[PDB]
Amino acid sequence: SEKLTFKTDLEKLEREKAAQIGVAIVDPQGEIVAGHRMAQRFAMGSTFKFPLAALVFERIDSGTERGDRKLSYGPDMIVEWSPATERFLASGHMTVLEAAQAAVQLSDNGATNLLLREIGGPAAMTQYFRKIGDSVSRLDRKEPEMSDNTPGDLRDTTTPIAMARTVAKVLYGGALTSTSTHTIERWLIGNQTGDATLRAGFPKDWVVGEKTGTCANGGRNDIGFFKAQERDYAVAVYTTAPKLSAVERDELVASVGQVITQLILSTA
Ligand SMILES: *C(=O)[C@H]([C@@H](C)O)[C@H]1CC(SCCNC=N)=C(C(=O)O)N1
Known part of the structure; x- marks a missing residue:
């Protein structure tokens, strides 16, 4: 059983790394593949x-927000890990789209x-989850707390x-116009922070964002998401590994990517 190997291999990582590994893989309609x-x-x-x-793209699609609208700010908005915000600080603003892409x-x-300041804060983020059929995800605080x-x-x-079902709704379930869906897909593919995590464990010919x-x-x-040939999937991986170093946590998520790959390839 390929799904049994998937479970067994995740449980071996959990035991050996003193970790908890949460995974869900769903198809474009949200149907469960494995977890x-x-x-x-x-x-x-x-x-x-x-x-x-x-959420921002839904507002752009609707017209209640404009992508090129300039969001003014001062140094009060600089918090831990704000690389683009710091660079744009002297100019005094980032647009809605610049901020979302960063x-x-x-x-x-x-x-x-x-x-968050513009869209209504954590309460509004939570309402968007509910609107798109996610009764589970909740934002209560801003970053980084x-x-x-x-x-x-x-x-x-x-x-x-x-979360996997929310990803599928956004990318495949019609939450956004075709143009906004394509834009957010390209942003995920071009993400700059994931080179050592999931996409390090997926085949190099799969489209991954x-x-x-x-x-x-x-x-x-x-x-x-990943696309294996013509087959699209949404994926969510959450891990907890308090005893690992930062590099070992990246490698843990990459290993989960390999376990996912082995399942998908074998079930063809
Ligand atoms: C997100 O989880 C945190 C935020 C809550 O503080 C930030 C910090 C790290 S930064 C990753 C830099 N990548 C690098 N080479 C992330 C993250 O995306 O993991 N987000």
Whole structure:
């Protein structure tokens, strides 16, 4: 059984790395392909920045937001890990689209908070999840405190299955216009922060786009999509490994990518 090998290989990684590995793989319609701890809650960390950009694109599609609108800010918006926000600070603004692309591709915290200030904060992010059929994911705080990952805390969490289904809804389920869907897909493919995580474990001819996260207390996450030939999939991986180094956590997620690959290739 290929799915049994998938489960066994994930459980070996969990034992050997003292880790918990949550995974869900779904098809474009949200049907389950495989998973592990798929409805256990994990802290989202920066992975929510992908749904945040989808919310922004919904508003652009609708006309309630404009992509080229200039969002003014001062140094009060610079927080830990704000590389683009810091570069644009002297100019005094980033556009909605610039901020969204920095949030997705650089995980820029200041840019993320700039967008949260505009769209209604964590409560509005949570309402967007509900609107697109996700009753599970919740944003309660802005960055970086939303990544605190205090053991047992349900704030700022999702589950692998709920997030994978949200990814599928955004990329394949008609949440966005064809133009906005293509734009956000390209942003995920061009992500700058994921070279050592999931896409390091997938074949080099698969089209892969994803959004990483890192949370305190050992959280390392990666969500997105892969296309194996003509077959599209949405995927969400959330891991907790408090005893590993940062590099070993990257390698853990890459290993999960290989375990996913072995399943997908064998089930053809
Ligand atoms: C997201 O989880 C955090 C945010 C909550 O503080 C930021 C910090 C790291 S930065 C990754 C830099 N990549 C590099 N070479 C991420 C992340 O995407 O993992 N997001």
